[PDB]
Amino acid sequence: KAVKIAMDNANARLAKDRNGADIPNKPLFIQNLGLQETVNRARNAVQKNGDTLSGGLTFENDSILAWIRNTDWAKIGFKNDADSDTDSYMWFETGDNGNEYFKWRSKQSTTTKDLMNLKWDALSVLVNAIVNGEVISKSANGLRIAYGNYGFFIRNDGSNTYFMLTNSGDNMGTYNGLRPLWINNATGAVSMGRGLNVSGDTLSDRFAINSSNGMWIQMRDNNAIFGKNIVNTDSAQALLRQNHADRKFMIGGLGNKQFGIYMINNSRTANGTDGQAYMDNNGNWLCGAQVIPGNYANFDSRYVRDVRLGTQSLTGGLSRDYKAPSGHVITGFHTDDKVYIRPVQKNINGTWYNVASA
């Protein structure tokens, strides 16, 4: 049995043909081999076909997180050459046809709402955009409201700022020929090319009419200030008014009947006016009171202003038949029978003339 001890010893040893199946404590064998940490790190290893993590991942160099598929991609990286790098940034990139883009969306239960898309030619915000800072465009057609039939936009071309309009059905389009309002950027002057309608008072230092030149009858159509509403026949309408301390003066008219100057004292309460000087519908000029010229020459030359008898003279006491000279009347007698006579005289325009006898 001395070889039985050698046989039992051999029987206590790992058999080639059993390939480790005869190891009595396999976890200890792995341990003794030095493989426990290998076992533990492989048990805790993120798997390439997907996994869940309980700690964070950190890239320590210039490495990229990518989705790469069908020769296209989405990529996140961090550009940073040194701590002092003046153009360092986290970047997000899509490729490789130019039309792969960026989308932000949120989910409430099973509903998905897209919030923002960023594409090659435009950031599309599908919700509101609320900016605490200033909103600045560096394009000429900088600010647009494309809503409904016509778009509205502000165009600053560097020299003038326009309020612009599109044609109908083209609210994203270029401007048409309308120029409702623009500003001269160098001088501040405001212009409007399609007229202006003001409710209430329009106050200005001066009003300049783009005034016209032409024939008499074209005064109907000259550029002017005018009353848009006709004056009704036999109704009163003033178009211009000057206030004085105790009275007001008006340019206006009685429809189809009168046009001119009217005065109303502030103390008046009964209907009417206190002074009138106006043209009627036949072209006469009428005044409710006196017409006082500074020079009366064209009137004084029309009328007799005085009549008188001139100096008395005596004829020669003479014949049985006598006729007084032209313009004279008999004013006495002296009996050689003489007769007194005087000339009748008329004052025209400051000169005394002798009357004529037919």
Binding site: R308, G310, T311, Q312, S313, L314, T315, G316, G317, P325, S326, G327, H328, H334, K338, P343, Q345, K346, I348, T351, W352, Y353, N354, A356
Partner: protein, 103 residues
Amino acid sequence: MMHLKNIKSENPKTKEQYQLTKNFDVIWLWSEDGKNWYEEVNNFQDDTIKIVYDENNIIVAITKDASTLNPEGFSVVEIPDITANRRADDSGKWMFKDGAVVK
């Protein structure tokens, strides 16, 4: 002083005289030397005596205001207002020859 002889009526010579004759029948008087009576009235002195005498130089009219005269067919002379001239009346008892004479 002022002296206009043989003042007679003649047609108006100018446009303004023509209008006054056309509209107011003014009979324009002229002296034999061509002076217009109505325009020369303002050249008389205010406080002198103005004499009217006939072709025979009998004084027929006297005044201090020449515009009150109608000297058609007579002569007008202006003389200073003196006591020797205030005695002449409009009767035919005074003549004129470089002054007033008695009878």
